[PDB]
């Protein structure tokens, strides 16, 4: 009869509880305190305009129906008591395909404090949309957003809030960076009210600022192209009595400029506007063709 008292506490706790009714349905407004701990900022896909993130998502609120009194002040319960109480229905406005992990059991945490405060934590991987504007590729900086809020609960029923100071709420781990091509500079939180066809909802916004690294595209495209241009300008020092040599010079450098441009344009997505690598390739192609026409004239 050592565990019978806790069974009695939990039975009295769930005796008379309706998990279809939010706390304070016609009496008050439900206050939810949110927190995000990013365990790894995943890879940023440029052709799909998306990114991956792995977070501990924490939500706290107050339910006056779950007050108890016993030898412990906090009950660290399982992940099956959370399905027998009311939990908020938070969704991500710009999420594409997220997963809530359940290996080996559902990764959820519930702690009830003796005055009625609940802490509810989940571990989940979110795949969100990041609309990018690629004029300055590959020297561009982005602000990838992450907006979440409540589905079906308007502003007069459920409102969100950060649990700590807004500059110290979204916390990114140190080893959590799976970025090969970008660089995470900082975070930026925000809060607002959007309005849709069912009413006005509260939306909590987070911005991650990314800055692309140029060190790969330099060696990939910018240096072979300049080398090809220099090799085209080499031809101006040869003697005109060897016409097939300079002819094969000109035509093969135009051919190599074509192969580098085709092999270079597969890197970035199928955007409909011109970038800065296209301007570089176009001006260099103009220089090689100008050299060839100069050879033709001389």
């Amino acid at each position, epitope marked *: 009869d050592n565990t019978t008292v806790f069974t009695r506490i939990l039975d009295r706790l769930l005796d008379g509880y309706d998990n279809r009714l939010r706390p304070g349905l016609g009496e008050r407004v439900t206050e939810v305190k949110t927190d995000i701990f990013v365990t790894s900022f995943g890879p940023v896909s440029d052709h799909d305009m998306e990114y991956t993130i792995d977070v501990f998502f924490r939500q706290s609120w*107050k339910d006056e129906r779950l007050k108890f009194k016993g030898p412990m002040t906090v009950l660290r319960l399982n992940n099956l008591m959370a399905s027998k109480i009311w939990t908020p229905d938070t969704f991500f406005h710009n999420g594409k395909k997220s997963v809530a992990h359940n290996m080996t059991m559902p990764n959820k945490l519930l702690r009830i404090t003796e*005055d009625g*405060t609940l802490l509810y934590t989940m571990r989940l991987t979110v795949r969100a949309e990041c609309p990018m504007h690629l004029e300055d590729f590959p020297m561009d900086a982005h602000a990838c957003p992450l907006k979440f809020g409540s589905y079906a609960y308007t502003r007069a029923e459920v409102v969100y*809030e950060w649990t700590r*100071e*807004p*500059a110290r709420s979204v916390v990114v781990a140190e080893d959590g960076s799976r970025l090969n091509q970008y660089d995470l500079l900082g975070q*930026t*939180v*925000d*809060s*607002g009210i959007v309005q849709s066809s069912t009413g006005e909802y509260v939306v909590m916004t987070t911005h991650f600022h990314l800055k692309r690294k140029i060190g790969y595209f330099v060696i990939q495209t910018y240096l072979p192209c300049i080398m090809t241009v220099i090799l085209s300008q080499v031809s101006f020092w040869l003697n005109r009595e060897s016409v097939p040599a300079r002819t094969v010079f000109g035509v093969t450098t135009v051919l190599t400029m074509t192969t580098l441009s085709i092999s270079a344009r597969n890197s970035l997505p199928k955007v409909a506007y011109a970038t800065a690598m296209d301007w570089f390739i176009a001006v260099c192609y103009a220089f090689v063709f100008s050299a060839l026409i100069e050879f033709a004239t001389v």
Partner: antibody, heavy 116, light 105 residues
Framework: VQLQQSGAELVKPGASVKLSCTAS????????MYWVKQRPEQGLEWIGR????????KYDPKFQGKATITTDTFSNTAYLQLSSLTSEDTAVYYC???????????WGQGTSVTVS | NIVMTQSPKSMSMSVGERVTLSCKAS??????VSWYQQKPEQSPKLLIY???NRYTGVPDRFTGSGSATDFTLTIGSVQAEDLADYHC????????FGAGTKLEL
């Protein structure tokens, strides 16, 4: 709904003071409690921050090590202890409650602390 | 430490016209700036929270307009009891207030 502070008093330079702020109408374990200091005809200055549910505090770097904020949930009060006073401590001290998108909506009545 | 610079220090105007007060931040404070009103020998009262959200119990003549760095408070058709001190304070980080703004008739 209401915050009641202690009464004004004088204090000798080099002593210690303990100002109190008793909350009525709510439970201090839900919100944060801020302490603000105002000099005559100057701007407001933030002293420190206490989280009564957990117990951790933060202080302004100018007041770090000089002030100590504590709480007592039984009597529903919050205390600010000032030590090693100087002549530049003559000000008005306010006890504020956080709420509605980090706004400090409810303030106290303010105590006048004078150093002779 | 985010500092808030308020402008101007003082403004003298009559009853009935529109008046505007400005507040500027050094760093970024995204719609977390509140506006308080302090009458002589009283405690400050919250007027506007968020950046544009009237507190429950304030008249409709106060209006806030917000951004990432530049904020403004506009009072249209002032009265004889709307003369007080006005402070802008940020809450994105640990809170810091402005210098104040006297309003005289």
């Amino acid at each position: 709904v209401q915050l009641q502070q202690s009464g004004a008093e004088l204090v000798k330079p080099g002593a210690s003071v303990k100002l109190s702020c008793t909350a009525s109408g709510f439970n201090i374990k839900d919100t944060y409690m801020y302490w603000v200091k105002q000099r005559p005809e100057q701007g407001l200055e933030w002293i420190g921050r206490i989280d009564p549910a957990n117990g951790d505090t933060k202080y302004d770097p100018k007041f770090q090590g000089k002030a100590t904020i504590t709480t007592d949930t039984f009597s529903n009060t919050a205390y600010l202890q000032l030590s090693s006073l100087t002549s530049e401590d003559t000000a008005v001290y306010y006890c504020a409650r956080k709420g509605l998108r980090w706004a400090m909506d409810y303030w106290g009545q303010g105590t006048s602390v004078t150093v002779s | 430490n985010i500092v808030m610079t308020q402008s101007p220090k003082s403004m003298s105007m009559s009853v009935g016209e529109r008046v505007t007060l400005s507040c500027k931040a050094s760093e970024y404070v995204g719609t977390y700036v509140s506006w308080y009103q302090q009458k002589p020998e009283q405690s400050p009262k919250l007027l506007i929270y968020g950046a544009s959200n009237r507190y429950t119990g304030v008249p409709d003549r106060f209006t806030g307009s917000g951004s990432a760095t530049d904020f403004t408070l506009t009072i249209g058709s002032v009265q004889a009891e709307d003369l007080a001190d006005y402070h802008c304070g940020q809450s994105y980080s640990y809170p810091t207030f402005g210098a104040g703004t006297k309003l005289e008739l």
